[PDB]
A and B are shown apart, each in its own frame.
Chain A
Amino acid sequence: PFQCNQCGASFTQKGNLLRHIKLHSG
């Protein structure tokens, strides 16, 4: 459902995406 950026990942819950996008920053 979700997609990411710069890397191309995908997760299931919006809360998980909030974690992913922060790991990209740091």
Chain B
Amino acid sequence: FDTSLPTSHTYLGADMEEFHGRTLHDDDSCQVIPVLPQVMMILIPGQTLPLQLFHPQEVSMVRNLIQKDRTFAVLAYSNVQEREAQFGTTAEIYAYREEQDFGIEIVKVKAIGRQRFKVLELRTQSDGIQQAKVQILPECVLPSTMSAVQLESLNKCQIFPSKPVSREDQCSYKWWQKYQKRKFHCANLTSWPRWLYSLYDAETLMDRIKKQLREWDENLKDDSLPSNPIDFSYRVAACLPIDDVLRIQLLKIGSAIQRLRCELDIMNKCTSLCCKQCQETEITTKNEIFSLSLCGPMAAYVNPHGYVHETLTVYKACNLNLIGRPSTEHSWFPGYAWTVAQCKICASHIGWKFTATKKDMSPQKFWGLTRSALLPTIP
């Protein structure tokens, strides 16, 4: 089906009281922001997080947070648990509603990462929620590499014409070569060639990543993937399956160009996926992962008991056993059901099988694999 339904989380609720999001701090700051417990994942800025909180204390914290500035900390827990965190992301709330249900206090929340911080101290409060003294990392952008030695005479020959049509044979290599030769004409003053300066270019890395991502979807260049280097880098980082340590490493990166180069390197050096209790599995084909969502291959989704199963959508997978009828109670994708897919050796839960219901769609397949137990076994 379309790609705009798996981004509003209609399984959670329909009548969400939304808010216009304007809440930003200014670089160097010492601000105390609340930390929601029982959440353990790395949140890239710009990524949506759906929360369904049941415990009375967390509900009260969210109720107080809505009235004040709607922001809370999502600490990027390292390999060590028990508050052993050093970095994290601030999440702004824009969706919120309560449902008495079988009378407890249920609150459903949707929030997106906004800024990046490093923690200084983690003062705990006797109420059950812990605050966090955090310093906010600035979003620094470096100037153009040619601007340092750009010739004064050669400044008008820098505004290139827009992209003609899109993704046509001989419409990329022919134009990109001319762009490289014209923009980096001052490279001959220095002792480095033009292609080396093209390696550290802003738009060039964007287009290489776009070319290597077009194997996943058909999104138009003029939209979808944002033109902003920062937004593009974060969006690309939030939609790739590798281990947490590399998410923390990518989050630590300060400049957009360094992050873009790191994303290209990892994207070239990743080949397979594997179970995280076993030796091998068949999902090894990383080429067959398709984005049936506007948010990319992956997004964050919440089950009926609050647990946030981040899910990777794949078209084929083996070494999994399917148990149960195709139930569709709390389906994340409205048209399909789920049938809980286990592992074939270690008997560990890995994703679901989204069987279909109608004719003119994918009658089967579309497996959604959870990130928790996928080990990117790149040889």
The chain A residues found within 8 Å of chain B, CB to CB, are: 5-10, 23-24
Binding site for A on B (CB under 8 A): 303, 305, 307, 323-324, 338, 340, 342, 347-349
Which residue in chain A gives the minimum CB-CB distance to B306?
A6
Whether the pair A6, B349 counts as a contact (CB closer than 8 A) is: yes
| Contact A6–B307 (Cβ < 8 Å) | yes
Note all chain B residues with C-beta closer than 8 A to A10. Answer: 324
Q: Give CA–CA (A23, B323) in the complex, Å.
A: 16
Least CB separation from A6: chain B residue? B307
Max chain B Cβ within 10 angstroms of own Cβ: one of A5, A7, A24: A7
Which partner residue on chain A sits nearest B327 by CB separation? Answer: A8
Please indicate the chain A residues that have their CB under 8 angstroms from the CB of B323 in the complex: 9
A23 to B348, CA, bound (A): 7
Q: Once the chains are docked, how many angstroms separate the CA of A5 from the CA of B340?
A: 12
Q: Which residues of A contact B340 (CB under 8 A)?
A: 7-9
Nearest A residue to B350, CB-CB:
A7
Q: A5-B305, A8-B340, A9-B340 are in contact. Are A23 and B324 (CB under 8 A)?
A: no
Of residues B303, B323, B324, B349, which shows the largest number of chain A Cβ atoms within 10 Å of its Cβ? B349
Query: What are 20 residue pairs bridging A and B, where the CB atoms are less than 8 Å apart in the complex?
Result: A5-B305, A6-B303, A6-B305, A6-B307, A6-B349, A7-B340, A7-B349, A8-B303, A8-B324, A8-B338, A8-B340, A9-B323, A9-B324, A9-B340, A9-B342, A9-B349, A10-B324, A23-B347, A23-B348, A24-B349
